[PDB]
From a paper:
Interhelical interactions between side chains of residues at the e and g positions as well as the packing of these amino acids against the hydrophobic a and d core residues also contribute significantly to oligomerization-state specificity of coiled coils. This is exemplified by the trimerization motif Arg(g)-h(a)-x-x-h(d)-Glu(e) (denoted R-hxxhE where h(a) = Ile, Leu, Val, Met; h(d) = Leu, Ile, Val; x = any amino acid residue) that specifies a three-stranded, parallel topology of coiled-coil domains. The trimerization driving force of the motif can be explained by optimal side chain–side chain interactions whereby the strictly conserved arginine and glutamate residues form a distinct, bifurcated, interhelical salt-bridge network and participate in the formation of the hydrophobic core by establishing tight packing interactions to the neighbouring residues at the a and d positions through their aliphatic moieties. Because of its substantial size of 18 continuous heptad repeats, we used a combination of trimer-specific determinants to switch the cortexillin-1 coiled coil from a dimer to a trimer. Accordingly, we rationally substituted residues to complement two ideal trimerizer motifs of the type R-IxxIE and introduced one additional hydrophobic core isoleucine residue in the trigger sequence of the cortexillin-1 coiled coil (referred to as Cort-Ir-M1).
Because high-resolution structural information could not be obtained for the full-length Cort-Ir-M1 trimer, the aim of the present study was to perform a detailed structural characterization of two fragments spanning the trigger sequence of the trimeric Cort-Ir-M1 coiled coil using circular dichroism, anatytical ultracentrifugation and x-ray crystallography. As expected, the peptide forms a trimer with characteristics typical of left-handed parallel coiled coils. Accordingly, the conformations of side chains and the position of the water molecule between Arg7 and Glu12, and Arg14 and Glu19 can be superimposed almost perfectly onto the trimerization motifs of the coronin-1 coiled coil, ccβ and GCN4p-M3, demonstrating structural conservation of the motif (not shown). Tight interhelical hydrophobic contacts involve the side chain of Ile8′ at position a′ of the first trimerization motif, which is optimally shielded from solvent exposure by the aliphatic side-chain portion of Arg7. In the structure, the five introduced isoleucine residues can be accommodated in the most preferred rotamer at the hydrophobic core positions. Accordingly, the acute packing geometries of the five isoleucine residues are very similar to those seen in the crystal structure of the trimeric GCN4-pII variant, in which all a and d positions are occupied by isoleucine residues (not shown). Notably, a similar optimal packing of the hydrophobic core and the presence of an extensive network of surface salt bridges are typically observed in thermostable proteins.
Author numbering:
A (entry chain A): -1 to 25
B (entry chain B), C (entry chain C): 1 to 25
The structure:
């Protein structure tokens, strides 16, 4: 239900942010 | 939960702004 | 809701770090 969907959206956002962080790293 | 859904929407909006304004993503 | 709220705070802080990140170009 709603709690499980919130958790999925959170997971998706966490991955989204992690990708940007990795992509903006100092070389 | 309603407040949480609210933060989530606002979070996605900040991400969209980043995705729009930054070159390096 | 406690772990969800923590995860939201952590997201927001990480998003703040991106918003205030260096301009790479």
């Amino acid at each position: 239900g709603s709690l499980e969907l919130i958790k999925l959206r959170i997971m998706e956002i966490e991955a989204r942010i992690a990708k940007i962080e990795k992509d903006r790293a100092i070389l």
